[PDB]
Every structure is written in C-alpha cells, then in structure tokens.
C-alpha cells in the first residue's frame, strides 16, 4: 500500500499474512472463521505455506503471533489464470485459529448485498509502500 | 515491503467507469476501487477490501491486480466477493 498509514495494532483482527517456509510474506488473507482463510487464487498457496495471525510488526519478536498450518487448498474452479477472473482461494487450516482481541473474523456479504460506487471502504496489508 | 501493517481508505467505482482505465480486462466478478491517491501494491494480493455496513466490516473485495507501477491514479482490481460468496458458502458446508 502506496500512500497508506500505519494501522492501529490489532484493529484489523481478520488480517493474516501468508509466508513461505523462508518466512517471506508473499500474500495477505482474511479469516472468515477459526478454520477458514480467504485469499487470492493467484497467490498460489501451497500446504508448505503458513498463515500468521495476530501480527502487526513483521520485524518484531515479542508479538504473540499465531502460525497456523495449511491442511488444504480450494482454488475456485471458475478461476481463470489467463484473465485472473474469479481470483479466490479458500484455505482450510489444520489448526483452529484462537480468537482473541487481535484475532477475529470478517463478515461475508450477501450475494444480493449492494456496495454503491462512491462508497468509501478500506484495504490493508504489508505490500510495498513505494515502487 | 513495510514491517508494520498499513491501511488506506478508498472509494469504490462502477465496473463501467472502471473500464475506462482497464477496458475488457474488467470482468463481472471484478470490482474496482482507488484512483484516489492511494493504491494496493505487490504483496497486498489476497488481503482485504472491507466496507462498514450496519456497523460491522464485511469483505467486499479481495486484492487482485492492477497497475504494474502501483500508480495512485489508476483504479485497483479486487475480486468481487458478492459473486463468489455462493461458492464460499458451498465450500464450507461441504468441508
């Protein structure tokens, strides 16, 4: 995020970090409950990857993070890698997330729910801040 | 990439208007937001696009693709969750 601001630590409890075994942050995700994480299909998540919950400062050693194992990867089969259309993948955790003050779920909308153009929303993450 | 979590507000746009930047790359299951002085960038993919509705935050978009430069004047492309939620609800109920 280019032009963002630092979040209040623990204010986006559903935000997770996808790391590979090297410990490198490669994609973000959102917790929808204690056993399921939603991300992008294009992220190419594998079961050797790990989901980190409740983290704020990725260079901190005193944070009580939760590193969760990935049991299974469900890429929507309507996902089109040519167009990147339907870019959603669910991840089934092996180990339930422990919901705390800093670890919670986002709500899913209704297929019918309406988000009007012009509405102001928020996005978060640990993506580049400059290019 | 920054080590602390970052946030940004950004307005949602219509697909129509979005096609002015992107054109045909925009699909029915895509939703644009941004072009407001901020932008999602590399490493933000898979993360949240939330909107407060009835007091709670709800996932409306998933960080997908955009400008190769993360230009803050081009709209970002996010997966439209409203068009994919029937799949998530089916996937959770099966497994």
């Amino acid at each position: 995020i280019v032009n963002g601001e630092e979040a209040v630590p623990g204010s986006w409890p559903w935000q997770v970090s996808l790391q590979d075994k090297t410990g490198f942050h490669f994609c973000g995700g959102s917790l929808i409950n204690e056993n399921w994480v939603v991300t992008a299909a294009h992220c190419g998540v594998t079961t050797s990857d790990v989901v980190v919950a409740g983290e704020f400062d990725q260079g901190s050693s005193s944070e009580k993070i939760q590193k969760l194992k990935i049991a299974k990867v469900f890429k929507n089969s309507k996902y089109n890698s040519l167009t990147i259309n339907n870019d959603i993948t669910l991840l089934k955790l092996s180990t339930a997330a422990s919901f705390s003050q800093t670890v919670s779920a986002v709500c899913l909308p209704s297929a019918s729910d309406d988000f009007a153009a012009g509405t102001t929303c928020v996005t978060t993450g640990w993506g580049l801040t400059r290019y | 990439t920054p080590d602390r979590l970052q946030q940004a507000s950004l307005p949602l746009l219509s697909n129509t208007n979005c096609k002015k930047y992107w054109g045909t790359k925009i699909k029915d299951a895509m939703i644009c937001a941004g072009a407001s002085g901020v932008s999602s960038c590399m490493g933000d993919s898979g993360g949240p696009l939330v909107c407060k509705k009835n007091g709670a935050w709800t996932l409306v978009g998933i960080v997908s693709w955009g400008s190769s430069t993360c230009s803050t004047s081009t709209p970002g492309v996010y997966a439209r969750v409203t068009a994919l939620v029937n799949w998530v609800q089916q996937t959770l109920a099966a497994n």
């Binding site: 979040a7 209040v8 630590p9 623990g10 204010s11 986006w12 409890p13 559903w14 929808i32 705390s100 003050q101 800093t102 919670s104 779920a105 986002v106 709500c107 899913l108 928020v122 | 946030q7 507000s9 939330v50 407060k52 007091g55 709670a56 935050w57 709800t58």
Partner: peptide
Amino acid sequence: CGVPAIQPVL
C-alpha cells in the same frame, strides 16, 4: 463478525 475489539483509527 466484523466488530474488532480494538477499534480501527482511520
């Protein structure tokens, strides 16, 4: 869902 314990400060 959607109601964090630590209110986001925008």
